[PDB]
Amino acid sequence: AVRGSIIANMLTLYPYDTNYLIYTQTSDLNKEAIASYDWAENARKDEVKFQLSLAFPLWRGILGPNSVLGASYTQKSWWQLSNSEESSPFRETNYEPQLFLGFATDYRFAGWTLRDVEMGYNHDSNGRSDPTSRSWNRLYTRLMAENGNWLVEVKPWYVVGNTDDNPDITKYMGYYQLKIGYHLGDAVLSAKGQYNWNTGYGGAELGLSYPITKHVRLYTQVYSGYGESLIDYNFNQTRVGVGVMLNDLF
């Protein structure tokens, strides 16, 4: 089985990243970037945030017994539920589809065991038009290794193609994302961050989850920093939220 291995599992729908629904409250709401929306001025700091993440095997065995041509779809949304006055609109959705090539490996080194090696294309959108449109594409490599109750993932990338809606996004995002998971009994502690040294901008996301049932977990999240979403890429905030989860990191 190997817990947390996206590619191994991938070799009923398949999860990719985590899936979850939480009720959040942000330290501040970026009214500036969404000022062109009629409702923008009466925007509240409490939103429902949720994420879906599916993985789809397209061609298993394309380069051997442990490889796969695959695709994923991760979608995050921030919803102004409590804002009944404006018709509880969606503030923002990020659509993040990937086309990739992944390997279920077993390369051991220093007690660690590298289990996923994945290389592909990444497109990340917010589906809006001008002037609220946000977008960037990336060639990345996702690398995951395990060690007992530890899981560590590193996903470096190279920004490719056009970035006109957010030229300087890479200034706030960085060139890689780092995940740390920890298995305290059935509780999963998780750390998700990215940071650009040359600029000093970045952001982190802490998390704690515990099962209620075989398919549902209690979950709490704390995001703090830049780039929580595309429309808030150049905007800092601390958001905290509580809700439910299907699958975590492992």
Side-chain angles (χ1 to χ4, degrees), residues 21-30 34 39 43-50 77-83 89-93 228-229 231-232 237 239-242:
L21 171 72
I22 53 169
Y23 199 81
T24 84
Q25 221 263 355
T26 178
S27 69
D28 197 50
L29 196 105
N30 187 22
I34 66 170
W39 66 274
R44 334 223 302 129
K45 303 166 180 291
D46 64 298
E47 317 189 276
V48 162
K49 176 178 174 178
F50 70 84
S77 290
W78 296 260
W79 175 26
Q80 300 248 303
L81 171 68
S82 69
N83 198 355
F90 269 47
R91 180 176 67 87
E92 178 80 353
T93 301
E228 175 190 29
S229 70
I231 195 72
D232 295 348
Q237 80 222 289
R239 161 176 262 121
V240 50
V242 178

Side-chain angles (χ1 to χ4, degrees), residues 224-245:
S224 188
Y226 291 82
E228 175 190 29
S229 70
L230 287 176
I231 195 72
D232 295 348
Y233 79 103
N234 51 197
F235 184 95
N236 174 94
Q237 80 222 289
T238 287
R239 161 176 262 121
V240 50
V242 178
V244 277
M245 171 175 262

Side-chain angles (χ1 to χ4, degrees), residues 7-8 10-11 59-69 102-105:
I7 304 301
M10 210 184 301
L11 293 167
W59 188 345
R60 290 177 168 102
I62 187 184
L63 307 187
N66 282 14
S67 70
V68 54
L69 209 215
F103 303 86
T105 64

